[PDB]
Amino acid sequence: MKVVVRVRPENTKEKAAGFHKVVHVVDKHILVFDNKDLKFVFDAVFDETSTQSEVFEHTTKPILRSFLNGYNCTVLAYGATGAGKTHTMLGSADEPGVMYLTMLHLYKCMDEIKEEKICSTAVSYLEVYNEQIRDLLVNSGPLAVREDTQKGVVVHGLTLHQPKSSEEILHLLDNGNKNRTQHATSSRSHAVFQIYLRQQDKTASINQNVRIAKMSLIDLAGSERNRSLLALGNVINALAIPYRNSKLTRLLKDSLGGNCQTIMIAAVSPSSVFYDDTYNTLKYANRAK
Ligand SMILES: Nc1ncnc2c1ncn2[C@@H]1O[C@H](COP(=O)(O)OP(=O)(O)O)[C@@H](O)[C@H]1O
Ligand SMILES: [Mg+2]
């Protein structure tokens, strides 16, 4: 598991009331929390000026190399409410986040390799709220987690989609985000965007049985002081396995387990009003390595 940290910039109000900053980014790998004057080291640290592109380049852009080699991949956006999880994963109208950037790059990579491999993909978007799985793109009752013969986790009843263009990708993700359980969006909504890749050699037959590769991009529930969130942590400690303890971890039974390429983007607010939130998130992220 790769672990990176994203420090968001303070908002207009926070700056006016200019309280002391609780996080100081030294360089690409090192930050300082706070006294306690704690030095943390991470695979990557993105400061207040980081663009979506920089985050993408150091997160899913490399992991896509693994995805196109048939490895399941997982990206977990973790941290307290207001820290940046959604801006990072979904983004805004001006700055599309990691889900969109990932999808465009995937489409570009599939086009580039068409002389070596035959590809097709689909995506789904679901929520876990209160141990209930809801399809975010079609109004349906809660769904259950099953397993195929090859120990692929399936969500029976989840709809699959094929947005071809930039705008369809944006529209799908926006619709999905608006159907998350409301509070603004509930702080306890986990949102799980998944991409399914079928890939085969040029010379294989068109119905060769091929394992579907899965990338999960996950905007987690807020960690501010929820069986799913804590179960996630039980699994993460463990690894460094209680997958069954929760709906979320059951979901990821095939997507965290050794083999998979996984990354955590710990989002943190730098303001001293979020001292405790940030301290806990930083300790959690430090645990995940
Ligand atoms: N790095 C960023 N750059 C600019 N604004 C950000 C950034 N990260 C978060 N924000 C802003 O702070 C806010 C809270 O971010 P959000 O992603 O919704 O938090 P979370 O999903 O972790 O609860 C939003 O208004 C968002 O636009
Ligand atoms: Mg959010």
Give me the side-by-side strand order of the main sheet.
5-1-13-6-12-11-7-8
According to CATH, what is the class? Alpha Beta
Determine the number of helices (DSSP H or I, runs of at least 4 residues). Answer: 9
Which small-molecule ligands are present, each listed once?
Answer: adenosine-5'-diphosphate, magnesium ion
**Main beta sheet:** 8 strands, mixed
Cross-link (Glycyl lysine isopeptide (Lys-Gly) (interchain with G-Cter in SUMO2)): 13
Protein name: Kinesin-like protein KIF18A
Binding site for ATP: 79-86
Organism: Homo sapiens
Task: Describe how the helices and strands are arranged.
Layout: E1 2-7, H1 12-16, E2 23-25, E3 30-33, E4 38-41, E5 44-46, H2 52-57, H3 60-67, E6 73-78, H4 85-89, H5 98-112, E7 117-129, E8 132-135, E9 144-147, E10 153-156, H6 166-178, E11 190-201, E12 213-219, H7 227-239, H8 247-251, E13 261-268, H9 275-287
Parallel strand pairs: 1-5, 1-13, 6-12, 6-13
Antiparallel strand pairs: 2-3, 3-4, 7-8, 7-11, 9-10, 11-12
Bound molecules: adenosine-5'-diphosphate and magnesium ion.
Residues 85-86 line the site of magnesium ion.
Structural write-up:
The protein is 29% helix and 27% strand. The chain is built from nine helices and 13 strands. An eight-stranded mixed sheet has the order 5-1-13-6-12-11-7-8, sandwiched between helices. Strands 2-3-4 form a three-stranded antiparallel sheet, with helices on one face. The chain has a single domain (1-289), classed as Kinesin (3-Layer(aba) Sandwich). The structure holds adenosine-5'-diphosphate and magnesium ion (MG). Adenosine-5'-diphosphate binds at residues 8-9, 79, 81-87, 92, 267.
